[PDB]
Amino acid sequence: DTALSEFGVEGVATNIGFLRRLLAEQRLETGWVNTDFVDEKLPELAAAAVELYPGEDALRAQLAGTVVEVAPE
Amino acid sequence: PRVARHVVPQNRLRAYDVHRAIEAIVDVGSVLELRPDYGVGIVTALVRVEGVPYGLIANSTHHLGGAIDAEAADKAGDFLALCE
Amino acid sequence: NAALAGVCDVIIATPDANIGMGGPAMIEGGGLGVYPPEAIGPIAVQRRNGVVGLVARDEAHAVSLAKQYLSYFQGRLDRWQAPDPRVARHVVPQNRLRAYDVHRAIEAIVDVGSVLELRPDYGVGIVTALVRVEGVPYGLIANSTHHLGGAIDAEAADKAGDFLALCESFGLPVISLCDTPGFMVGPDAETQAAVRRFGRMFVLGARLTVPLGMIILRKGYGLGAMAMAGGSFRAPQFTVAWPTGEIGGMGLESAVRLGYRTDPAERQNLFDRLVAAAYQHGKALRAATTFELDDVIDPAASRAWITRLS
Amino acid sequence: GADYPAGAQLVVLEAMKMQHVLAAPDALRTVRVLVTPGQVVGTGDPLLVFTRTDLDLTRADLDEVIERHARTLDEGRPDAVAKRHRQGRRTARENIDDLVDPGSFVEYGALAIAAQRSRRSEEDLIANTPADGLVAGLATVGADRFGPAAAQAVVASYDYTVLAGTQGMRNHAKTDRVFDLAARKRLPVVLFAEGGRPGDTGAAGLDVPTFRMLAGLRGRVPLVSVVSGRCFAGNAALAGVCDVIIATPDANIGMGGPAMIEGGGLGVYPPEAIGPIAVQRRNGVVGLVARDEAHAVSLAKQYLSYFQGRLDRWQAPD
Amino acid sequence: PRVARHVVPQNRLRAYDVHRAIEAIVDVGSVLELRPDYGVGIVTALVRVEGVPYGLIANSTHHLGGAIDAEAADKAGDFLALCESFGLPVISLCDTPGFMVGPDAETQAAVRRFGRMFVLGARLTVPLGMIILRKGYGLGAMAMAGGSFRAPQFTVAWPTGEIGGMGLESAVRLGYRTDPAERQNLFDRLVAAAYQHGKALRAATTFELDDVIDPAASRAWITRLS
Incomplete structure (x- = not known):
């Protein structure tokens, strides 16, 4: 997944999103899926698809998460 | 006015924020910078000095030391065509 | 010399042409190192970004094209x-x-x-x-x-x-x-x-x-x-x-x-x-x-x- | 840009230490050359472009068109051309090609058909609505005596054979198109008005620019209107916004068509009793009275001549 | 303003005095009607709306039902040449079935004369606002606006307005042709009926008019003309 995310492609549409969505599936955490899996999950998976001027600093996220409250500008 | 005097650093190497410069000249709150995240090399803004409207362009040190690149040149060319 | 050339309507250049806003001396004075003139405005780079309007075979051809270009604005x-x-x-x-x-x-x-x-x-x-x-x-x-x-x-x-x-x-x-x-x-x-x-x-x-x-x-x-x-x-x-x-x-x-x-x-x-x-x-x-x-x-x-x- | 036969040397590279010689794959003509002596190339890099080294073989395309066009002309309409000559009068295209200099006409909207698919079908509209009733375009008049530039002019005629030469959606759009040009190029206009439509009892065409456009050309360019037959309603309006009106004794011009005189409750009158070449000859509505159609076109040519040079x-x- | 609302009679047949209409719009006492006993078909007057000078033309019902005849056409053509010449913005109150038709009309050189009204409106380079009071049909209604309903800066209408290529009755008299004694009956049945699908509101639906206003709004619109 990390590999697929760090893959930058611009200009041509790809299926990096689909594959990415596909690795996230759970049945697949068992080590394998069968010949029909990717077909019965296609529609489900198909759907699921800054500079600073001197004197300024940027407050970054310490770790991943969902923003609940932010200060005003 | 006396504030405009400290805007530019005496050490010719220490970069500075253009906005501090602009704000030290045009009257308070009259600045309206257009396309700030585009051709960032140069600032194009509509301002006011004693209530009169002016167009303003300015080289920003935060980019290439002030160097005018192909994109910041285009942007400034556009703004000059607007003012004219 | 380039500045003048790029403020014009058309630029007729010959394959051996090298146009650039900055001379190797300037690219160097800016600390970007040292480059040979044949690597600045290759008739190939300028042929694409729309800097060179007409590419001539040789000097006599470039002058020929220049004469022809004017002709449209002459009558x-x-x-x-x-x-x-x-x-x-x-x-x-x-x-x-x-x-x-x-x-x-x-x-x-x-x-x-x-x-x-x-x-x-x-x-x-x-x-x-x-x-x-x-x-x-x-x-x-x-x-x-x-x-x-x-x-x-x-x-x-x-x-x-x-x-x-x-x-x-x-x-x-x-x-x-x-x-x-x-x-x-x-x-x-x-x-x-x-x-x-x-x-x-x-x-x-x-x-x-x-x-x-x-x-x-x-x-x-x-x-x-x-x-x-x-x-x-x-x-x-x-x-x-x-x-x-x-x-x-x-x-x-x-x-x-x-x-x-x-x-x-x-x-x-x-x-x-x-x-x-x-x-x-x-x-x-x-x-x-x-x-x-x-x-x-x-x-x-x-x-x-x-x-x-x- | 040089022709070389098959085998002819085209480029020379220096591989290891010896010289590889690239030649013409066959009889070719150089076009572009993206390579200059001295540069280092890689495998497969393009060195130059080239072109390897009947006209009467007719094609369907051009034919369907020739036909569709030819079905608009006089020849392709013996039926309507007969009824006209029967009545002792020229057709729209006969008058036009008489006025206009030998093949200087550039017709606009020839393949236009009426704008009513609800009263008819596309089939008969295409054969019974040629040019939607209006043959209009650019031309020259007196180009032999004056320049082909000064003799330029917009020319338009209503075709009585098509819906009594009345005005309609499509031909309105054609008059606008053509009166726009007269202005764009400051060209004189010669209009063969005559005529006076099914779905007219709706969308009121009160916003039509046609009348205002011609009126507005008044002092700018010479406006000539030729009239034979019946000229009522909008057709007359246009005719009376002009500089001169050349009419033939059989002419009847009136702002209101017998249908309008009737719709207003004033009863019913026959068209020969509306704008008699005698009434309009006196109140200064008709400027020139022609003996016949060929004479009216003759006078029109002469009238323009004074404003042409x-x-x-x-x-x-x- | 609320007075302008009663000026035009709801019964589309009952004539009314234009002057009441004009006076309900322009400011009090600003009217100066010129040549009132001449080309009585149309009223040409110099007026004022919020102190600003305007030229004003308007069809009068008391004449031929609003019909524009050869003489009232001449008079309006003159006034439009006056306004254009002295830069006066025009106000056009329309209530006409069209140009007077008939064999007799054609004798008074109406083709040349109605044409002059078309040419003189085609030359107006001053703002012209138009308000259809009741009837606005045919080329006559177009002339009243410069030559096209698009020509005016605004072509608006009062609730009593009716638009069309030809008047309601003209349409009925044609598309329906039997009554021995009294036809006047069945006629005003097809007329009052057809009216519903030729009124101002319907026209406004297809944008053939810029709007159908509350007559008290006349000023607010005209005001935008200067």
Whole structure:
């Protein structure tokens, strides 16, 4: 997944999103899926698809998460 | 006015924020910078000095030391065509 | 020396040419190191970004082109030779799918050897060239199918707008050979600021005060087709089309793709039939019937129409 | 840009230490050359472009068109051309090609058909509504005596054979198109008005620019109106917004058509009792009275001549 | 303002005095009607709306039902040449079925005369606002506006307005042709009926009019003319 995310492609549409969505599936955490899996999950998976001027600093996220409250500008 | 005097650093190497410069000249709150995240090399803004409207362009040190690149040149060319 | 050269209308350069705003001494004075002059403005780099307008074989040729370029802004020619009217009739293949060379259509219309195409390796979707019909100087723009099927992209838009301003500035009537499905779309086309760049093509067409005649060679759809006319099929002095033409808000295959949505293997087939079928109810003769075109002409008459423009 | 036969040397590269010589794959003509002596190339890099080294073979396309066009002309309509000559009058195209200089006409909207698919079908509209009733376009008049530039002119005629030469959606759009040009190029207009439509009892065409456009050309360019037959309603309006009206004795011009005089409750009158060449000859509505159609076109050509230039050959009286 | 609302009679047949209409719009006492006993078909007057000078033309019902005849056409043509010449913005109150038709009308050189009204409106380069009081049909109604309903800066209408290529009755008299004694009956049945699908509101639906206003709004619109 990390590999697929760090893959930058611009200009041509790809299926990096689909594959990415596909690795996230759970049945697949068992080590394998069968010949029909990717077909019965296609529609489900198909759907699921800054500079600073001197004197300024940027407050970054310490770790991943969902923003609940932010200060005003 | 006396504030405009400290805007530019005496050490010719220490970069500075253009906005501090602009704000030290045009009257308070009259600045309206257009396309700030585009051709960032140069600032194009509509301002006011004693209530009169002016167009303003300015080289920003935060980019290439002030160097005018192909994109910041285009942007400034556009703004000059607007003012004219 | 370059600054002066790039403030001009055209730059005629020879293969051994190297143009750059900064001399190796400047690239060095700026701390970017040291480079040899042959690696600054290669006739290959400048041939593409639209910096060099005409590429000459040698010095005598460059001077030849310079003499020719001026000629369009200097006056009419007395001796002129018309092409074989018949050739025009066979430029566009009768099969809407088979592509063809735009240079052929241009050369089948404007009189013999009067074509001088500018910045050809730049914004290749649209051809911008100074030409002549019966001795008179005209500016000419044309869609080339060899690029995106004729779709107008952000950069062809730029090159076209530039030319429309040139023509307007020195007053050359314009000849527009249209063959486009419209502007090139897509989330990627949008990242190249297509909204702002196509807008400028409309603005400069709106500013044309010179006569502009439009001939639809094959395709002429949506805004892109309009932009090619000045912003409307009403702006041109005459908006005529060859028999191979087809007009509409959106290209046929585009209407089909949207009006018919199942085939696992080859949809391509049901498509080609649903498209060649819809093509009959979208010809040029039909749009001619509702006056959406001033006429559907015999390609040998193109000149006769382009004449009443001057 | 040089022609070379098959085998002819085209480029020379220096591989290891020896020299590889690239030649013409066959009879070709150089076009573009993207390579300069001295540069280092890689495998497969393009060095130059080229073109390897009947006209009467008719094609369907051009034919369907020739036909569709030819079905608009006089020849393709013996039926209607007979009824006209029967009545002792010329057809729209006969008058036009008489006025206009030999093949200088550039017709606009020839393949236009009426705008009513609800009272008819596309089939008969295409054969019974040629040019929607109006043959209009660019031309030259007196180009032999004056320049082909000064003799330029917009020319239009209503075809009585098509719906009594009445005005309709499509031909309105054609008059606008053509009156726009007269202005764009400051060209004189010669209008063969005559006539006076199914779905007219709706969308009121009160926003039609036609009348305002011609009226607005008044002092700008010479406006000539030729009238034979019946000229009522909008057709008359246009005719009376002009500089001169050349009419033939059989002419009847009136702002209101018998249908309008009737719709207003004033009863029913026959068209020969509306704008008699005698009434309009007096109140200054008709400026020139022609003996016949060929004479009216003759006078129209002469009238324009004064606004077109000087004459070289002239004979002084005694 | 609320007074302007009662000026035009709801019964599309009951004539009314134009002066009441004009006076309900322009400011009090600003009216100066010129040549009132001449070309009585149309009223040409110099007026004021919020102190600003305007030229005003208006069809009078008391004449031929509003019909524009050869003489009232001449008079209006003159006034439009006056306004244009002295840069006065025009106000056009329309209530005409069209140009007076008939064989007799054609004798008074109406083709040349109605044409002069068309040419003189085609030359107006001053703002012209138009308000259809009741009837606005045919080329006559177009002339009243410069030559096209698009020509005016605004072509608006009062609730009592009716638009069309030809008047309601003209349409009925043609598309329906039997009554021995009294036809006047069945006639005003087809008329009052057809009216519903030719009124102002319907026209406004297809944007053939810029709007159908509350007559108290007349000023607010005219005001935008200067």
